[PDB]
Ligand binder design. Sequence first.
Ligand SMILES: C[S@@+](CC[C@H](N)C(=O)[O-])C[C@H]1O[C@@H](n2cnc3c(N)ncnc32)[C@H](O)[C@@H]1O
Ligand SMILES: C[S@@+](CC[C@H](N)C(=O)[O-])C[C@H]1O[C@@H](n2cnc3c(N)ncnc32)[C@H](O)[C@@H]1O
Ligand SMILES: COc1ccc2c(c1)[C@]13CCCC[C@@H]1[C@H](C2)N(C)CC3
Ligand SMILES: COc1ccc2c(c1)[C@]13CCCC[C@@H]1[C@H](C2)N(C)CC3
Lengths: 338, 338
Amino acid sequence: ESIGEIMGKLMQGEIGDEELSKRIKEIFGKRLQWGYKPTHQQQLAFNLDFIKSLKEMDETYELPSAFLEAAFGKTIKQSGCYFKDETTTIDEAEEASHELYCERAQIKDGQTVLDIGCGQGGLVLHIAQKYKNCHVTGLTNSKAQKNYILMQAEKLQLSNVDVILADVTKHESDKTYDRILVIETIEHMKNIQLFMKKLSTWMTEDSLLFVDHICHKTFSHHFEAIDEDDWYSGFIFPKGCVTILSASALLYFQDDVTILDHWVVNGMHMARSVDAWRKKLDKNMELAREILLPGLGSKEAVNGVITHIRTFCMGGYEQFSYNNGEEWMVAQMLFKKK
Amino acid sequence: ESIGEIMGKLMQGEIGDEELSKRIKEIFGKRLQWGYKPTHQQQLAFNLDFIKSLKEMDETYELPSAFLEAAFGKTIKQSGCYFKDETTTIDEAEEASHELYCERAQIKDGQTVLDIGCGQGGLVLHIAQKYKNCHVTGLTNSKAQKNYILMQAEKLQLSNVDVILADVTKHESDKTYDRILVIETIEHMKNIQLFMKKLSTWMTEDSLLFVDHICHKTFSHHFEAIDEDDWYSGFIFPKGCVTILSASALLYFQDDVTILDHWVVNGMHMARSVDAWRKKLDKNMELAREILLPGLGSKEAVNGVITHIRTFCMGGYEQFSYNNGEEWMVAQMLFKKK
Ligand SMILES: C[S@@+](CC[C@H](N)C(=O)[O-])C[C@H]1O[C@@H](n2cnc3c(N)ncnc32)[C@H](O)[C@@H]1O
Ligand SMILES: C[S@@+](CC[C@H](N)C(=O)[O-])C[C@H]1O[C@@H](n2cnc3c(N)ncnc32)[C@H](O)[C@@H]1O
Ligand SMILES: COc1ccc2c(c1)[C@]13CCCC[C@@H]1[C@H](C2)N(C)CC3
Ligand SMILES: COc1ccc2c(c1)[C@]13CCCC[C@@H]1[C@H](C2)N(C)CC3
């Protein structure tokens, strides 16, 4: 029907989960139709056009930590996790994911480590705890996040953690690091070529860079509506600020760094992640509503924020589970400096 | 049946074209089964293993030119050509291919141009004729090829052509070039990382490198038998000396050069190329046998050489036409120096 109509029913909670899932799945299906070309010749033409376009491109309210704790796993990881079993808990999946990054980024005790867009600092705290001679720096644009990480470090008796409060695109420093990690942050970068260039200036010849990003296995796209029938994309990200690179897109951004290894993690891991958050939010729904009320001012504003987050999870499930995780998934790459 | 048995019937010309095509198609089908993995995770693991393996790797009889002229097109191009129409002739398809390379490599009058593994020099002669202020150098490991090119240049009143006689892997020079072209030569390179490094030392900051190579669109493989049922691979290349890179494989070889653009050409163009050579050889069969007899010594040795070349064409047809050209095809990349 009308977008305004669907949006209305959604906010009133009049769309059941089955219908909601069905509608979002169909939106993603149309994206697949948009992205897949009939020949590899056409596929590469499409993909290179996107990559060329990238090379031309040059807040106030934050959720309380108590709410984040009620919706996300123990370390409030806000990125795809890794689920060995169907019964793996979100807390276990956070730890597994942290361990996977440490292996693939070849973290060793004694290294200086920078985590770019470190969020609530789960990975920073993991590395700091596991490798006592490492010196781990998180970089975040959120004062609330910085404060949370430093508190957790204090509680965990960690003395090897610091946090830089900065917009990474504006941050200037002569400091270099043995390891730079970027976990699901590059999706938010307006200018990737300049981003990778900046990162290279923070590396020495001995450094490694590890990037993890949501991807599609074949093509790239901005997270935005194709047509007027897509109410979902703009509801979730009202800004044109998220890019879903193809699994191979970063191979074309080796001006300043050199690839050493490349992996993908099947989308069912991400699907199980957002499912876990959705289920946990649902379980703690009453508590969540109570926590949010002070800072939001009305029970209607609370309902709005919850609907947004819950829909993000329901939609993410359809996206990443599509074709048993073989459409949208997570890409990982390891680089050295050129 | 037995490989020795099939080889026996083949040499006696007792295998009809239909059976021959069917047998070779089945061999290529098994390669597809070998190369395609069930998940992108597994596909990338497979592909990166191949790319890592590459990074660890560190004659007497030539066909008379008269024979080559009887089998190949006018400029004796020995690489995939480009066929606009079903009725495009091989001579037209050679020229079209030459033009495509000139466009994609951004050839401009006045440039110094190096063609690595230039063969019988069709592209060298094309650029020299079209761009009178260019200075075009072909590099070949064949004295016969060098002699052929220089004769043709003399006949065509070209004064802007030279030929280096060298094994490119051994060639040392301080000379740089505005444009370096590599047309279906990298498939023969034992050590690609060192090859690309060497090429970079022959470039300035203003240079471009253009590489064209046979590929598969998804995976890489050596041109060799998977199993004991494959009589074809070792008959065509009795040496383990040809590598079929995936369409994206060279993206992982940007230590010394930086990608600017990337294309593929659908495999039907290659299929139509080998078909044209096969048909022309068939037409000039009597003449070919006469030409070859002096230098081969026996009518049996002649038959052997012809069977080899003809089978190469029949097999190439099945390979490149597989799934309407959407399996094996031609990859092209444009690079600048790092
Ligand atoms: C999807 S979250 C991932 C967070 C964390 N790496 C994790 O795995 O939980 C991406 C993070 O990048 C941060 N971010 C976005 N743009 C940024 C910028 N310009 N400078 C610094 N951080 C930024 C966001 O605030 C967010 O915390
Ligand atoms: C498939 S042919 C392509 C020839 C030509 N570029 C064309 O398009 O017709 C590849 C060429 O590379 C040459 N070649 C192979 N190894 C070489 C080496 N080490 N040095 C120089 N040329 C080499 C072969 O002799 C052959 O002429
Ligand atoms: C369900 O799949 C998705 C889809 C989009 C997004 C995510 C996950 C993230 C995890 C949760 C917080 C927001 C994140 C953001 C957008 N970035 C780009 C990646 C991880
Ligand atoms: C029919 O498809 C093929 C398959 C293999 C090969 C070819 C074409 C070439 C053209 C003809 C001369 C030999 C060439 C050699 C091997 N190189 C690697 C590429 C081009």
